[PDB]
Design an enzyme around this catalytic site. Structure first.
Site, short mmCIF file in Angstrom:
data_model
loop_
_atom_site.label_atom_id
_atom_site.label_comp_id
_atom_site.label_asym_id
_atom_site.label_seq_id
_atom_site.Cartn_x
_atom_site.Cartn_y
_atom_site.Cartn_z
N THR A 268 6.13 -4.67 5.86
CA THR A 268 6.38 -3.40 4.87
C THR A 268 5.59 -2.07 5.01
O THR A 268 5.56 -1.15 5.04
CB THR A 268 6.43 -3.35 3.78
N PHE A 393 7.01 0.07 -4.83
CA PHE A 393 5.96 -0.52 -4.97
C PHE A 393 6.53 -1.85 -5.61
O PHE A 393 5.86 -2.54 -7.20
CB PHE A 393 4.88 -0.32 -5.33
N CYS A 400 3.81 -4.79 -7.16
CA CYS A 400 2.83 -4.06 -6.01
C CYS A 400 1.87 -4.79 -6.18
O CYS A 400 1.41 -3.97 -6.81
CB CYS A 400 2.78 -4.24 -4.66
C1 HEM Z 1 4.64 0.22 2.44
C2 HEM Z 1 3.57 -0.78 1.82
C3 HEM Z 1 4.35 -2.17 1.28
C4 HEM Z 1 5.74 -2.13 -0.22
C5 HEM Z 1 7.22 -1.33 0.65
C6 HEM Z 1 5.35 -3.05 -0.96
C7 HEM Z 1 6.67 -3.76 -1.87
C8 HEM Z 1 6.86 -5.04 -2.80
C9 HEM Z 1 7.73 -4.65 -3.78
C10 HEM Z 1 9.17 -3.37 -3.54
C11 HEM Z 1 7.73 -5.38 -4.69
C12 HEM Z 1 8.27 -6.28 -5.89
C13 HEM Z 1 9.46 -6.96 -5.34
C14 HEM Z 1 10.13 -7.61 -6.00
O1 HEM Z 1 10.27 -7.24 -7.78
O2 HEM Z 1 11.27 -8.35 -6.07
C15 HEM Z 1 6.08 -5.32 -3.72
C16 HEM Z 1 5.28 -7.04 -4.82
C17 HEM Z 1 4.20 -7.54 -4.00
N1 HEM Z 1 3.53 -7.76 -2.33
FE1 HEM Z 1 4.08 -5.67 -1.58
N2 HEM Z 1 4.57 -4.10 -0.85
C18 HEM Z 1 3.90 -3.21 -0.07
C19 HEM Z 1 2.32 -3.70 0.44
C20 HEM Z 1 1.74 -4.78 -0.03
C21 HEM Z 1 0.74 -5.25 0.91
C22 HEM Z 1 -0.50 -4.85 2.31
C23 HEM Z 1 0.70 -6.52 0.24
C24 HEM Z 1 -0.18 -8.14 0.12
C25 HEM Z 1 -2.20 -7.57 0.12
C26 HEM Z 1 1.23 -6.62 -0.82
C27 HEM Z 1 2.15 -8.28 -1.21
C28 HEM Z 1 2.91 -8.35 -2.53
C29 HEM Z 1 2.79 -9.66 -3.48
C30 HEM Z 1 2.33 -10.71 -3.69
C31 HEM Z 1 4.00 -9.27 -4.12
C32 HEM Z 1 4.51 -9.98 -5.43
C33 HEM Z 1 3.17 -10.01 -6.35
C34 HEM Z 1 3.49 -10.62 -8.24
O3 HEM Z 1 4.70 -10.88 -8.49
O4 HEM Z 1 2.41 -10.23 -8.61
N3 HEM Z 1 2.09 -5.79 -0.44
N4 HEM Z 1 5.69 -5.11 -3.01
#
Ligand code: HEM
Ligand SMILES: CCCCCCCCCCCCCCCC(=O)O
EC number: 1.14.14.1
Length: 458
Positions: A268, A393, A400
């Site tokens: 992403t 996010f 996130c």
């Molecule tokens: C523009 C960059 C990024 C976007 C648009 C993004 C988007 C999201 C979204 C929408 C969710 C929520 C998911 C859901 O509700 O099902 C999310 C959760 C998450 N993201 Fe990202 N993300 C980004 C960068 C990252 C990066 C760089 C990492 C790893 C270092 C990351 C790891 C995670 C993890 C592990 C979760 C779920 C965590 C949890 O439930 O505790 N994301 N992200």
């Protein structure tokens, strides 16, 4: 009263399923949402999801006392190789909170200061590649963005080098990730998986996952030896213990978080840096403004942590890119109890709500009329923006974990790209958006002539 709910076209037994028989399901759903409005029901064989498009309803679904994260059919499919990692587990699944707590200090401001040096390592490599192209040549934006983003997460988080820049084709892990996400998307529109017409699919699926898991093994193997050990994301997976449960993570789960953070920690962000550059070339004045801030602030050969933090306008450029095309374009929630949504729509315990993020970001009642234009200045006063209008996010405690990671990497990199290069839309690129659950432009190419400012160090 109370409604009642709009539904798109149906096809007898399959109900709404044929409608997303396309290589572009999200985008179709946005068009559906253009016609039907704030909320519409989607039903496939034996599953029903309501897609939300408006702030006034999405603010409600974002109430963590009423709705909680839900694994969509999409996430259930991704769970086949994401396992029970942070992304694909329920809030009340033992392994979620346990890992959340253990892994959270790997995203504190003190970890970022320590990730910076390695972030610059990978960024410098990208600039150098672009510096070394011949005049007859062009840049393949998302391909090079994926190169950067994977290599960045691999080094900062695992002290492993993918060396994506020593490859002219995509890294096998990426090829396998793309094929596996591509299948997950393609199971959403078939509802007949048993059929041996899909026998080759599940064979390649298992082949892809082994490729992914084989890499994890090498990552873990490299760690055991090493010696001059780092203090990164993997170090916390192995050594951290959860205060609540008093427990370390078991090896089965570690393997899942390595695959989770290798994928969700780059894909992403690659999409973001792609979409960001695209909008900047389509909008040469805001680009100039971004280049000026870049040049003014990045007065050293290599950026410091404080300097990236000072790139205010770049931050606004990335946010506006996240407005128009959020790269993780949807998230799912379920009703904790029987409830009524927005005074008009009655929901039952465990009913699904998919937040259609791109449509949320186009709600005219929030963003004013000019929603379709690229204007970073919208974020000059975020306090004016109502709660739960901007959600790229995710939401709440399931938001996130790597948000500041993404942004910091994206800010540094975009900032450096703009200091060292002038860009040119030589083909006058027409936006094609590839869908692999995530969103990323296909075939977006540019040319960059060097500003001939020196580099190298740290
Ligand atoms: C523009 C960059 C990024 C976007 C648009 C993004 C988007 C999201 C979204 C929408 C969710 C929520 C998911 C859901 O509700 O099902 C999310 C959760 C998450 N993201 Fe990202 N993300 C980004 C960068 C990252 C990066 C760089 C990492 C790893 C270092 C990351 C790891 C995670 C993890 C592990 C979760 C779920 C965590 C949890 O439930 O505790 N994301 N992200
Ligand atoms: C990198 C982690 C990947 C997790 C996936 C995040 C993107 C959200 C899922 C988008 C799928 C939307 C398509 C509609 C699916 C359907 O209802 O049939």
């Amino acid at each position: 009263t109370i409604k009642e709910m709009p539904q798109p076209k149906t096809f007898g037994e399959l109900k709404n399923l044929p409608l997303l028989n396309t290589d572009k399901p999200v985008q179709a759903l946005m068009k559906i949402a253009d016609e039907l409005g704030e909320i519409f029901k989607f039903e496939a064989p034996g599953r029903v999801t309501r897609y939300l498009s408006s702030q006034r309803l999405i603010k409600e679904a974002c109430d963590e006392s009423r709705f909680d994260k839900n694994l969509s059919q999409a996430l259930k499919f991704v769970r086949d190789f994401f396992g029970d990692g942070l992304f694909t587990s329920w809030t009340h699944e033992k392994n979620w909170k346990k890992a959340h707590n253990i892994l959270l200090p790997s995203f504190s401001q003190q970890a970022m200061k320590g990730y910076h040096a390695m972030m610059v390592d990978i960024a410098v490599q990208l600039v150098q590649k672009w510096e070394r192209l011949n005049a007859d040549e062009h840049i393949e934006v998302p391909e090079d963005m994926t190169r950067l983003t994977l290599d960045t997460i691999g080094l900062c988080g695992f002290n492993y080098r993918f060396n994506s820049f020593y490859r002219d084709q995509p890294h096998p892990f990426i090829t396998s990730m793309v094929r596996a996400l591509d299948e997950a998307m393609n199971k959403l529109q078939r509802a007949n998986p048993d059929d041996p017409a899909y026998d080759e699919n599940k064979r390649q699926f298992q082949e892809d996952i082994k490729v992914m898991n084989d890499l994890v093994d090498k990552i873990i193997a490299d760690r055991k030896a090493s010696g001059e050990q780092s203090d990164d994301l993997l170090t916390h997976m192995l050594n951290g213990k959860d205060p609540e449960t008093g427990e370390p993570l078991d090896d089965e789960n570690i393997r899942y978080q390595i695959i989770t953070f290798l994928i969700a920690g780059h894909e992403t962000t690659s999409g973001l840096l792609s979409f960001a550059l695209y909008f900047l070339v389509k909008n040469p004045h805001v680009l100039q403004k971004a280049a000026e801030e870049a040049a003014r602030v990045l007065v050293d050969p290599v950026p410091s942590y404080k300097q990236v933090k000072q790139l205010k306008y770049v931050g606004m450029v990335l946010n506006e890119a996240l407005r128009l095309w959020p790269t993780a374009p949807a998230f799912s929630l379920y009703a904790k109890e029987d409830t009524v949504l927005g005074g008009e729509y009655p929901l039952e315990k465990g009913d699904e709500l998919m937040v259609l993020i791109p449509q949320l970001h186009r709600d005219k009642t929030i963003w004013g009329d000019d929603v379709e234009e690229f204007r970073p200045e919208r974020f000059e006063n975020p306090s004016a923006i109502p709660q739960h209008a901007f959600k790229p996010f995710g939401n709440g405690q399931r938001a996130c974990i790597g948000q500041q990671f993404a942004l910091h990497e994206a800010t540094l990199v975009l900032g450096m790209m703009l200091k060292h290069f002038d860009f040119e839309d030589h083909t006058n690129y027409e936006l094609d958006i590839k869908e692999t659950l995530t969103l990323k432009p296909e075939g977006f190419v540019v040319k960059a002539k060097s500003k001939k400012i020196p580099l190298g160090g740290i």
